[PDB]
Nucleic acid binder design. Structure first.
Ligand SMILES: [Zn+2]
Lengths: 126, 155, 206, 114, 23, 60, 83, 96
RNA sequence: CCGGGCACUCUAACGGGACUGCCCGCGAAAGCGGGAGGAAGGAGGGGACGACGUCUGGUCAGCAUGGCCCUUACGGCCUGGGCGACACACGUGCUACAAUGCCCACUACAAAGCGAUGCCACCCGGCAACGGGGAGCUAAUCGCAAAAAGGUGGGCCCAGUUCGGAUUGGGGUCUGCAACCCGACCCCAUGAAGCCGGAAUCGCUAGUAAUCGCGGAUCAGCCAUGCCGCGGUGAAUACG
């Protein structure tokens, strides 16, 4: 029936829900392409559903918050990986080799004092 | 880069062609993280070459890269009062990136106003073994091979 | 020149704030101000008694004050005269109900401030700086301290050229956060200038 | 053509109007409206009744090329006469609006003199 | 560009509002 | 010339605009925090002093 | 510029002095510390030694200097070039 | 409905847990101790008194928030409510 | 939006969790490379943390301080001007010189902070700045506040440009007692240099660079492109 995961990627939270069907995608009450229109990268969110091929099996009701769409996209790749193994832990095989089940540890590094950016030291002349 | 060799980044294969190398060429296209912009500009030139000489663009792509993948180059070496430029091989890691950087630069210099066409003409002439990017590869190894007398100084 | 203050480095880790009182934006600045002057008024009014700590908590409209000292009888006065003498005189300054309290310095050879103070009065009286330090550090470690260090900078012994003298003993792990390390500073000024005094007393890595 | 100068035919009237000294995007964005003229039409794409409409209109709306330059120099001329601080800056040819005179006044001082 | 008050972007970089940057 | 100056900052002027904020502790004028009234130095001193309730080295 | 919603600011004591000499006719060259005021049309025909920071610089008030501040015509700085 | 604001979380939680039992002692609803997001107020400053702007030092005031609510006021608790134990690093708000 | 529930996220406290823990091999060991699991693997990332001392470094202008120095003055008040000058020279920044662009309109997506004489919703007038009203907010609930780049469509068509906005003329809004020197912002007009920059030279190895925007401190105002942070997108390369 209902299946859930969570998406977190660089300040992006993704609440994913897997209800079996033809592969619907509602992102904040919107179509996938609707909420991601003009987004080149915003196609791989279902690739975990292309790792294990229940693409036309589960209808995806999902919400997302925080960060750009791209970060929102990665959280989607996370949430999709979650309910799958929750649905079928056998899916962990063909996901762990695919790395979908690991969260992106990358985060916007803290900006330091003195440094313009996290590592952008001002140009100095001796 | 003194302790380890700082192994490469495993790029993510693209959505359209599932390639990392395509993703690689995008990165040389990408400016200011504007991968959405650069992504179309490649995929647009995909359509373009798919129109002019309608084939597999990727077939056009790698064929273009093979025509510009360098294999021998010089390296500066100021041994004594003369700086040497030793003819050197190239790793496939650096073969592509040099070739990748070469094509994009030549694509940065064609006259057609939108970049997607400059890429379009560039990859075409690239697979055609023509254009300054191909010339860039030609000139180097020629320049490289022209100084084979410094071969044994290779380090 | 380059090291961190040990107390602030350990606030909320192993060491606790010296005046606990919640405040808002509107009253934090005002209630702080009288809180500062209370530290000063009790300071002179208790330095002779050997002041150790002035903990100032703020209940509703009355300052929960706690003074740590080695001479409680010297603090309270003639059977509690001076305490009232200050408990009133203090509230005159703060204006609110100045709730004053005294607390003895159990093993005053561990009070980094008092250990600093005592070294000051010695060097305040021309005593041997290099000697007083060791004698200072000695009984400190002799008093059960798990590590102690004392440093002094300035015109050591009236010399027109400054210098930093210091003696230590026992483990003094300044970097260990959970190393309970009482800091003590003593401003010992002479006829020929001022001498800085710092007391480091490691007690236990609680 | 128009009040002082001609508009580039291959360019749309929008930038063409602004080419008039004394006319920016604002008046360019407006005179077409008060004259009801479509801006998209190129200068070569302009009918006579439109232009004479716009010409007489804009020429009767604001002093643009010569008359405008009169007061401009006039305003600075009258400034220099009273001897105001502002007039001092002009008569010295230095940054009039409180700019940092020490550096970055090349726009008012031109080439460098080391 | 970003230094143009008349440009909306200029007021953006300027962080203000004018005729060319409504609110 | 600071005490009368830091005293002058205490009295009220002919116009509210002259009312500026000095350190309550060191009388300093620059880098003075409205929330504390202390200079950036007096803050740091009292900060490590532990007399500042809640205040502490912010190290995220 | 000063908001026209707000009145045209003029130092009243200096303004009042001007209105005073108006009744007493053009005379009594007015030294002023009041650089900040704007000239008023009454002020025309008068003269003032406007204070420049160290000195009261004499300024004759014409109609060409009505809508300006007083201090404008008193240059507070003396520049003569370099060398 | 009661708010709790302090600089410690322990004293809050010490205060909060005590109060949470208090209305629990004689009433309900004892709305659970809800940790509101802790309003932090950074304070950055140069370490040195003179220049060397670069070397800084960050300070903070984590005014930690906690809260509990009472659905039924339960005036027998209300006297218990006003009969409160407020440590010196806690402030309290009233509602229901 | 509500009732309704705490599922979920989140909020904020306590814990667990990564310890070469485990398997292979090397190694006397230390450890080392491979693998397994694992969210995290070999220092998981980033912080705070700066030894003896060095630089007779900096600071007497934060403070305190020995000493020397002035007391109808070098002290204190007021007024104004200066610290903003300006032939010049250097450092550090911002904006650019364009089509991977610029402009317009619509449409999204954050974080982190701030706010009772402050955020000011919303409304009206006003080209706008802003002004007149005016609720909520007393703070996860009111607001600041729109994120911007991004996406859609439109225009521009290589142009010193619909690039560029410097300067300057004028007309205004706001703060302020007062914006001349000496504020910012709005509007009109003006439309400078600048076609990617010699010698040389800087930073950066990952969510980094680069780019886009957001908040706060001081502050009435702001001369803030600074500073401290916050987030969006998001790289290339490392032979050695
Ligand atoms: Zn201070």
């Amino acid at each position: 029936e209902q299946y859930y995961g969570t998406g977190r990627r660089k300040e992006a939270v993704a609440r994913v829900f897997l209800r079996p069907g033809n592969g619907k995608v509602t992102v904040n009450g919107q179509d996938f392409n609707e909420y991601f229109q003009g987004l080149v990268r915003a196609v791989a969110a279902l690739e975990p559903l292309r790792a294990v091929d229940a693409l036309g099996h589960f209808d995806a009701y999902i919400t997302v918050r925080g960060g750009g769409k791209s970060g929102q996209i990665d959280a989607i790749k996370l949430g999709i990986a979650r309910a799958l193994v929750q649905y079928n832990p056998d899916y962990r095989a063909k996901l762990k080799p695919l790395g979908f089940l690991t969260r992106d540890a990358r985060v916007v590094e803290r900006k330091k004092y003195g440094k313009h950016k996290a590592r952008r030291a001002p140009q100095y002349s001796k | 880069a003194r302790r380890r060799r700082a192994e490469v980044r495993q790029l993510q294969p693209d959505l359209v062609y599932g390639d990392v190398l395509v993703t690689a060429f995008i990165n040389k296209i990408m400016r200011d993280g504007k991968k959405n912009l650069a992504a179309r500009i490649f995929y647009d030139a995909c359509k373009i070459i798919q129109e002019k000489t309608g084939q597999e663009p990727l077939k056009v792509f790698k064929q273009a890269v093979e025509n510009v993948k360098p294999r021998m180059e010089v390296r500066s070496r100021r041994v004594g009062g003369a700086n040497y430029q030793v003819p050197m091989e190239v790793s496939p890691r650096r073969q592509q990136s040099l070739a990748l950087r070469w094509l994009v630069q030549a694509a940065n210099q064609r006259p057609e106003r939108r970049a997607a066409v400059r890429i379009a003409h560039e990859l075409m002439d690239a697979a055609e073994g023509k254009g300054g990017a191909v010339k860039k590869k030609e000139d180097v190894e020629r320049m490289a091979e022209a100084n084979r007398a410094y071969a044994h100084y290779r380090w | 020149g380059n090291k961190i203050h040990p107390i602030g480095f350990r606030l909320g880790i192993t060491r606790d704030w010296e005046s606990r009182w919640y405040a808002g934006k509107k009253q934090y600045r005002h209630l702080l101000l009288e809180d500062q002057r209370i530290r000063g008024l009790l300071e002179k009014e208790l330095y002779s008694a050997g002041l150790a700590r002035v903990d100032i908590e703020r209940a509703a409209d009355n300052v929960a004050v706690t003074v740590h000292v080695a001479k409680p009888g010297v603090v309270i006065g003639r059977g509690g005269e001076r305490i009232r003498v200050l408990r009133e005189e203090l509230a005159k300054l703060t204006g609110k109900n100045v709730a004053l309290n005294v607390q003895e310095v159990q093993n005053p050879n561990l009070s980094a401030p008092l250990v600093a103070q005592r070294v000051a009065e010695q060097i305040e009286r021309r005593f041997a700086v290099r000697r007083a330090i060791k004698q200072a550090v000695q009984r400190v470690m002799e008093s059960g301290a798990k590590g102690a260090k004392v440093i002094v900078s300035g015109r050591i012994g009236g010399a027109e050229q400054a210098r930093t003298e210091w003696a230590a003993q026992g483990r003094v792990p300044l970097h260990t956060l959970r190393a309970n390390i009482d800091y003590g500073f003593a401003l010992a000024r002479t006829t020929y200038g001022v001498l800085g005094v710092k007391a480091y007393i490691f007690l236990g890595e609680v | 053509r128009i009040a002082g100068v001609e508009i580039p035919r291959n360019k749309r009237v929008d930038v063409a109007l602004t080419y008039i000294y004394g006319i920016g995007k604002a008046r360019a964005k407006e005179a077409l409206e008060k004259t009801g003229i479509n801006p998209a039409t190129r200068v070569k794409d302009l009918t006579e009744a439109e232009v004479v409409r716009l010409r007489e209109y804009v020429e009767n709306t604001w002093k643009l090329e010569g008359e405008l330059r009169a007061e401009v120099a006039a305003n600075i001329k009258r400034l220099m006469d009273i001897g105001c601080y502002r007039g001092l800056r002009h008569r010295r040819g230095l940054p009039v609006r409180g700019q940092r005179t020490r550096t970055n006044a090349r726009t008012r001082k031109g080439p460098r003199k080391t | 560009g970003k230094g143009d008050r008349r440009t909306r972007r200029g007021k953006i970089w300027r962080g203000t509002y004018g005729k060319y940057r409504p609110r | 010339a600071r005490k009368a100056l830091i005293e002058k900052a205490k009295r009220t002027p002919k116009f509210k605009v002259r009312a500026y904020t000095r350190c309550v502790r060191c009388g300093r004028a620059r880098s003075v925090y409205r929330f504390f009234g202390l200079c950036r130095i007096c803050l740091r001193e009292l900060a490590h002093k532990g007399q500042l309730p809640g205040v502490r080295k912010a190290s995220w | 510029p000063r908001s026209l919603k707000k009145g045209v600011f003029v130092d009243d004591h200096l303004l009042e002095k001007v209105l005073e000499l108006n009744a007493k006719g053009e005379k009594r060259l007015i030294k002023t510390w009041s650089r900040r005021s704007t000239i008023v049309p009454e002020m025309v025909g008068h003269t003032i030694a406007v204070y420049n920071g160290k000195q009261h610089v004499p300024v004759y008030i014409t109609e060409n200097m009505v809508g300006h501040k007083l201090g404008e015509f008193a240059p507070t700085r003396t520049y003569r070039g370099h060398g | 409905r009661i708010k709790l604001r302090g600089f410690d979380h322990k004293t809050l939680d010490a205060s909060a847990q005590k109060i949470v039992e208090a209305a629990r002692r004689s009433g309900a609803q004892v709305s659970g101790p809800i940790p509101l997001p802790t309003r932090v107020r950074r304070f950055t400053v140069i370490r040195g008194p003179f220049k060397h702007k670069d070397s800084r030092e960050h300070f903070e005031l984590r005014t930690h928030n906690r809260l509990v609510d009472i659905i039924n006021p339960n005036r027998k608790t209300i006297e218990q409510l006003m009969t409160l134990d407020l440590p010196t690093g806690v402030e309290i708000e009233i509602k229901t």
